[PDB]
Structures are given as C-alpha cells and as structure tokens.
Amino acid sequence: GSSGSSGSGEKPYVCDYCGKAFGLSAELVRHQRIHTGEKPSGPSSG
C-alpha cells in the first residue's frame, strides 16, 4: 500500500472534467484525450 506523490504544484492549466493540474497547455490538451476516446487505432487505453 504505497502512496505519496507530493511535488506537482497548482498549475494555471487545470482540467475540469476530472480535475487534473498541468503546467503546460500541451500537457492539458494531450490529457483531455482520456476524456475523448474515438477511433482508437491500436491497443492503448488505461
């Protein structure tokens, strides 16, 4: 039962769907992907 991920600070680019924080917009966009799943070309989803 491991735990503890202290390091990521409050970022200006935080998602609303789930509520994730991202320092760079790119990180936020690529993330939103998890929320938008369509035409999945290849076994990749978790």
- The residues binding Zn ion (CB under 5 A) are 15, 17-18, 20
CB of 1 to Zn ion, least distance (A): 26
Q: Is 19 helix (H, G, I), strand (E, B) or coil?
A: coil
14, containing H or E segment: strand 13-14
Select 18 or 24, whichever has its Cβ closest to Zn ion.
Answer: 18
Chain-centroid distance, C-alpha 24: 11
Select 2 or 36, whichever has its Cβ closest to Zn ion.
Answer: 36
21 φ/ψ angles, rounded to the nearest 5 degrees: -105, 135
CB of 22 to Zn ion, least distance (A): 9
